[PDB]
Structure formats: structure tokens, C-alpha cells
From a paper:
The crystal structure for the N-terminally His-tagged apo-PrBP/δ monomer was solved at a resolution of 1.81 Å (for data collection, structure determination and refinement statistics). We found in the cavity some, but not well-defined, electron density which indicate the presence of a flexible, small and polar molecule. Therefore we assigned this electron density as water molecules, which are located in H-bond distance to Arg61. In apo-form crystal structure Glu88, which has been shown to be involved in cargo binding, exists in two rotameric conformations.
Prenyl-binding protein (PrBP/δ) is a 17 kDa ubiquitous solubilization factor. In its 3D structure, it is highly similar to other solubilization factors such as RhoGDI or UNC119 (uncoordination mutant 119 of C. elegans) despite a very low sequence identity of 10% and 24%, respectively. In photoreceptor cells, PrBP/δ traffics prenylated cargo such as PDE6 and rhodopsin kinase from the site of protein synthesis (inner segment) to a specialized compartment (outer segment). According to these studies, regulated conformational changes of the hydrophobic cavity of PrBP/δ play a key role within its trafficking cycle.
Numbering used by the authors: -3 to 110, 117 to 150
Write the structure that this text describes.
Amino acid sequence: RGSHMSAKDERARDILRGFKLNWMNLRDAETGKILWQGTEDLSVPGVEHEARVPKKILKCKAVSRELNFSSAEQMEKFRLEQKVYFKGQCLEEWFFEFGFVIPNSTNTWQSLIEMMPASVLTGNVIIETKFFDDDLLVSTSKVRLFYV
């Protein structure tokens, strides 16, 4: 009976406690047309988040994403790994690295993200996001997408 807590376990939890995704948007990477804006803290694990995006986003060759996030804790190499799941099948693997995060900072992060109809995809796509500081997994979050 009992458990172990490491310094890395403490740090992971402390980063997550101090971390908040404040807002996020998606634009058509070519035209710059704003497709979706959201304010849900998608860093929160355990729960299933939801996002309702317009059907027209599927016609985009590439999407520009902008994230605004706050962090109480310092991070050396803040990064995201993302998986696009369709009915549990991983369609795409993405990798984004921000780098150093100043303690008690608010930061902005822009990323470029490059067949099935909206009627099939809607409610069946899950984006899983893993938040790291280098080796350290801080959070795993899930967002179910609806194409509306």
C-alpha cells in the first residue's frame, strides 16, 4: 500500500495548475479569413471538450491557428503533440514547439496546419493534444469536433 511522487510529477502538476489556454482562432491560411474563434481552456485534461467549426474549413488547403496562453510556471521547451482521430483511427500526427516560457507570462503562438464529408466527420473527429515541457508530459486533452 502506497505511492511514489517525484520532482517531475510535482513540476508537471504545478505547470498544469498555472497553465491556461485563454483563446484560440483558426483562419484560412491563404485569404486570412477568420473561420473559428474559441475561449475554452483546452489544456484541461480528463474531460471531453467540444468545438463547432464551419463546414467550409474542410475546403481550406491550409489553416493558420493562433493560440493565446498563460503560464505561472517557467518551461524550458514548451511543445504540443497532436493527433487527429477519426472513429479512433489516427489520420494525422502534428508537432509544434514554442520553446522557452517565461514565468507568469501571457504568450501568443501562431501555427500553419496543412475526402470525407462534414456529415461523416462531424462528432466523429477527436483532436488529442499533449502538452510537454521537453521530456515532461504536463497534460493530455481531447476536443470533439463538429462541422457546422
